[PDB]
Ligand binder design. Structure first.
Ligand SMILES: Cc1ncc(COP(=O)(O)O)c(C=O)c1O
Ligand SMILES: Cc1ncc(COP(=O)(O)O)c(C=O)c1O
Ligand SMILES: [Mg+2]
Lengths: 376, 373
């Protein structure tokens, strides 16, 4: 018997099984469970991969977005511009620090923050005069880099801080700049299903600013000052475990080949499916991390059921955009509302997508989708 | 070179069990909230005699989340020790409330109960902040004075979060540390009496509603469904791999607590007359996260121990109310002279369940020698 996985961690582990065992056993034996050598080693190796001078490992990708807001003093009285079509963390951290998220729609093709509407949202916030614009958190949704040149042009006028939410986009790139290396600071997650993932919770932050890096390293260890005995700011506890850094070192050594595989797999879906469903085209000069391979379909509920009847898993990202969820629905939304974010949940679907998807399994998936849409 | 807290000797004792447990998790691939997490919540719950255990990412988060559930924030006061690890006060600041620092007893090093009453009354009398909560710490594994604190909180309508970061395994009158107050919190930082091999934590309560709300907060404020968050939360989970480690640690904890009791009593009896020793009050078992004495010329003592290959550590060098980050917050009437003088004389010695008679004798010999005996 054979079967397919949505994101196949087992196939990946099989590839590097004994290397993972050794890396884990070394940490277990050495007894340096907190900030042991593998942590700094991973920060360095990931830094060179991404071309960023500073990598600050931490506990998870939510923490990774919160800490930069804390270092900038963002909090009560302050507005942070975020997509609604994203994972809750992007907006939640803004509320957690006492600031308000302001929700911006996404582009109907890239699923990433709409730049024109961002500009309008900032202008409306200034006109209302109740909050001060402080930051923008674009998301590289599904692995595809957001439009950082136009977003930064807006930030330049307004003095705003940009945090790249690269939770889903490690391995992605746009005109030879790696995802992670945009904005003032980048953030990611090593949640196990991400393109670069560990075997527990983990995260990191990225920046070329040495001062910002020093502040982040303070914040993640209770706001430690220049000495071991005096905390100079409010912080948190947000460390990447040595044991998870050891896992990540082995994941990182195969990430680039896996990115080639993902690109190959995505292109094969796009060429085979473009006439029956809406496919995620890769714009010139981009590589996506393909955290998800997301299509839009007529009768999407019908399609998903037929895929499951044929033993094919699929997932809807996202069922409820943030601005419609109870916790965030009272926060302000950009002028014009969020029609794209509101309508995508009725038609979007993510398909199995990982480096180990076989030709045969992909063919089967293609066949079911084409068949559903009346192709013989 | 002698270990301060010997995780190596502990690991050797359960080496194969740890390896099997870790192997199992690695192969199963349920790395987030895998079965070992719930298994561990159940077993720890049985050990502590609480109805609900909510595992989480670390002992700091474990203090923060209950404050969030209570809506504690701007305009509110939470009463805490200055003589403790930063997290105890930090989380109060982090939610927007203010810590109000209370001094500690010069023998137990735990929150002074009379001065807590003074502090609550004074904050009410002042009228700038509303009293919401108290976070006593079971410092070094010794339970705080919960009968008195609980009665005060009931009278004043305040919420008690027990900071049991250092006290799992400790008991007071047949009540387990972690089971006091409205909710308890702990750390599984590797050096704690119950520790994992990374960061981890947990919260404890008998209130089913609070437990459900805490399970929501630690996963971004999840509502009754998968797709609609109803409150602001965080990401605070205990990894499956660490739960697996913790199950093995828990299975030898009671024996280790007996060993720690034996080791500390032998220290107290042999050092009684040369230094101030941490006496165990009747009806208590301490978790002995640390074994803390006070000595004349403590700096000389520490250097002498170190010259003889024996590590020791000063907990704490700078009380929180003097630290830059917290120095602007209010202090209880009378000030905190105990918290301000302890750093000149306190010192913690090697303490763990595997301390050999030979190592302990050496340590004892050096301290007694230093003081002329
Ligand atoms: C876009 C985005 N941002 C932030 C996060 C939060 O990361 P973590 O899951 O490590 O808390 C996620 C989670 O995967 C995500 O998809
Ligand atoms: C008394 C006390 N409370 C809270 C904490 C925070 O726990 P964690 O280190 O798991 O963040 C510590 C850490 O040792 C502690 O000693
Ligand atoms: Mg962790």
């Amino acid at each position: 018997h054979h079967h397919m996985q949505f994101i196949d961690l087992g196939a990946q582990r099989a590839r590097i099984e004994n290397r993972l065992n050794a890396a884990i056993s070394k940490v277990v034996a050495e007894g340096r469970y907190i900030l042991g050598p593998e942590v700094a080693e991973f920060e360095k190796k990931l830094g060179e991969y991404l071309g960023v001078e500073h990598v600050i490992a931490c506990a998870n990708g939510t923490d990774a977005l919160q800490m930069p807001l804390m270092t900038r003093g963002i909090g009560p009285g302050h507005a942070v511009f975020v997509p609604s079509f994203t994972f809750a963390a992007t907006a939640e951290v803004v509320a957690l620090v006492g600031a308000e998220p302001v929700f911006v729609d996404v582009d109907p093709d890239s699923y990433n923050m709409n730049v024109e509407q961002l500009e309008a949202a900032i202008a409306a916030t200034i006109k209302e005069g109740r909050l001060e614009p402080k930051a923008i958190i674009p998301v590289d949704l599904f692995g595809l880099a957001a439009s950082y040149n136009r977003i930064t042009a807006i930030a330049e006028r307004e003095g705003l801080f940009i945090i790249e939410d690269a939770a889903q986009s490690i391995g992605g790139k746009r005109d030879n700049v790696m995802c992670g290396a945009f904005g003032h600071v980048g953030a990611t997650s090593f949640y196990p299903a991400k393109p670069l993932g560990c075997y527990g919770d983990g995260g990191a932050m990225f920046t070329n600013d040495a001062e910002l890096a020093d502040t982040l390293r303070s914040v993640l260890f209770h706001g430690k000052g220049e000495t071991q005995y005096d905390n100079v700011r409010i912080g948190i506890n947000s460390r990447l475990d040595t044991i998870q850094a050891a896992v990540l070192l082995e994941k990182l050594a195969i990430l680039e080949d896996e990115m080639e595989a993902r690109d190959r797999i995505a292109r094969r879906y796009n060429e085979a499916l473009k006439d029956v469903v809406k496919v995620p085209e890769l714009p010139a000069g981009n590589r996506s991390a393909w955290a998800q391979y997301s299509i839009e379909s007529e009768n999407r509920d019908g399609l998903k059921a037929q895929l499951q009847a044929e033993g094919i898993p699929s997932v809807i990202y996202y069922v409820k955009p943030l601005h419609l969820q109870t916790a965030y629905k009272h926060y302000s939304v950009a002028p014009g509302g969020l029609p794209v974010s509101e309508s995508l949940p009725s038609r979007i679907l993510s398909l199995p997508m990982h480096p180990y998807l076989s030709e045969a399994d992909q063919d089967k998936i293609i066949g079911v989708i084409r068949g559903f849409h009346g192709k013989k």
